[PDB]
Design a protein around this ligand. Structure first.
Ligand SMILES: *[C@@H]1O[C@H](CO)[C@@H](O)[C@H](O)[C@H]1NC(C)=O
Ligand SMILES: *[C@@H]1O[C@H](CO)[C@@H](O)[C@H](O)[C@H]1NC(C)=O
Ligand SMILES: *[C@@H]1O[C@H](CO)[C@@H](O)[C@H](O)[C@H]1NC(C)=O
Lengths: 207, 125
């Protein structure tokens, strides 16, 4: 079986309802077709054609307006022609749907509103309602989010994300989400954005 | 000329189908044997007939019932699957099990409309 393709997601793995996600499935093994499957479902979601140039071909699958159904794991496969056998599965891509619960989450800086140069930045995501996990994402750096299991503390459910000592790379806009146990790909509404700005070596929250 | 008109319309739609979907003469007679009723103008029935007789469902990749990797499909070597692939899966084009019937139906509807427009007008002239 041929080497697996690569499956990427743009803009990012976490998507809000009524939005369209471009999943790019590409390879260098001269594939003229790519097929997309989700969570073991026997019917393929989409079949796409891509003319290989020197063996390099990419299919930009477009998911339609997203709903609670789009949440899960996605794998794409590649084939040389209509009758050829399919490649090995690509590495699984996790697509998460937001805005699926009424419970809200809040993102704050556990050290405090300002963090000094020698101090560490710790981002606290919390909710009054029961959450199994909390997810942290940064704007622009749209990769796989940082998921931490929740803890019951101070009659709240919360997770601390230790970012380490203040650095200039910590600057940016951050959002956290919550997920419940049975449906880990369904997330809450995003928390209010937390913009962090580097000031005098230190970090500050900017509104 | 009512008999000539109903027989000629059927022949024209069969020829259009054979042209667009690269179906051999034998498949043309297979379609004719079920299209001879007054269903020659319904793209829906023709699409179902094409699906059943030419096994268009067997053109698409399938996954084993009890678990397994995706496979090309039982009919991928048949000419109908190559014709469907050229017609509806080019570079930059997309397809799913739900979209294919509608695409085939739209093209069959174009065939029917063109056949009867051309047949009526030439005869009237
Ligand atoms: C399809 O690709 C296979 C290689 O996986 C090749 O052996 C075969 O000849 C190809 N068939 C066509 C019709 O191009
Ligand atoms: C956080 O900062 C303190 C000193 O401010 C340091 O002792 C500690 O090691 C830092 N956290 C981690 C995880 O190292
Ligand atoms: C998908 O997008 C990439 C980059 O934008 C491009 O190289 C590729 O040709 C596109 N593929 C299709 C099928 O549009």
């Amino acid at each position: 079986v041929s080497k697996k393709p690569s499956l990427s997601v743009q803009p990012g793995p976490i998507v809000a309802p009524e939005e369209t996600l471009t999943l790019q499935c590409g390879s260098d093994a001269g594939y003229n077709r790519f097929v997309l499957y989700k969570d073991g479902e026997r019917d393929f979601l989409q079949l796409a054609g891509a003319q290989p140039q020197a063996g390099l071909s990419q299919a930009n699958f477009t998911l339609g307006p997203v709903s609670r159904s789009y949440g899960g794991q996605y794998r794409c496969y590649g084939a040389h022609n209509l009758s050829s056998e399919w490649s090995a599965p690509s590495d699984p891509l996790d697509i998460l749907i937001a805005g699926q619960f009424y419970d809200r989450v809040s993102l704050s800086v556990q050290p405090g509103p300002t963090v000094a140069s020698g101090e560490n930045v710790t981002l606290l995501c919390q909710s009054q309602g029961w959450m199994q996990t909390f997810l942290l994402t940064k704007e622009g750096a749209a990769d796989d989010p940082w998921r931490l299991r929740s803890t019951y503390q101070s009659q709240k459910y919360q997770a601390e994300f230790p970012m380490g000592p203040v650095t200039s790379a910590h600057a940016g806009t951050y959002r956290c989400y919550g997920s419940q146990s049975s449906k880990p790909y369904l997330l809450t509404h995003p928390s209010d954005p937390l913009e962090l700005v580097v000031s005098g070596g230190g970090g500050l929250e900017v509104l | 000329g009512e008999a000539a008109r109903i027989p000629a319309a059927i022949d024209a739609v069969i020829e259009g189908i054979k042209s667009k979907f690269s179906i051999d003469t034998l498949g043309g007679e297979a379609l004719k044997s079920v299209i001879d009723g007054t269903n020659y103008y319904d793209a829906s029935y023709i699409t179902t007939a094409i699906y059943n007789k030419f096994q268009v469902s067997s053109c698409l990749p399938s996954v084993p019932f009890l678990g397994g990797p995706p496979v090309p499909g039982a009919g991928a070597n048949k000419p109908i699957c190559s014709a469907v692939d050229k017609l509806y899966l080019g570079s930059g084009n997309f397809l799913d099990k739900s979209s294919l019937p509608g695409s085939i139906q739209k093209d069959v509807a174009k065939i029917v409309a063109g056949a009867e427009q051309a047949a009526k007008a030439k005869a009237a002239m």
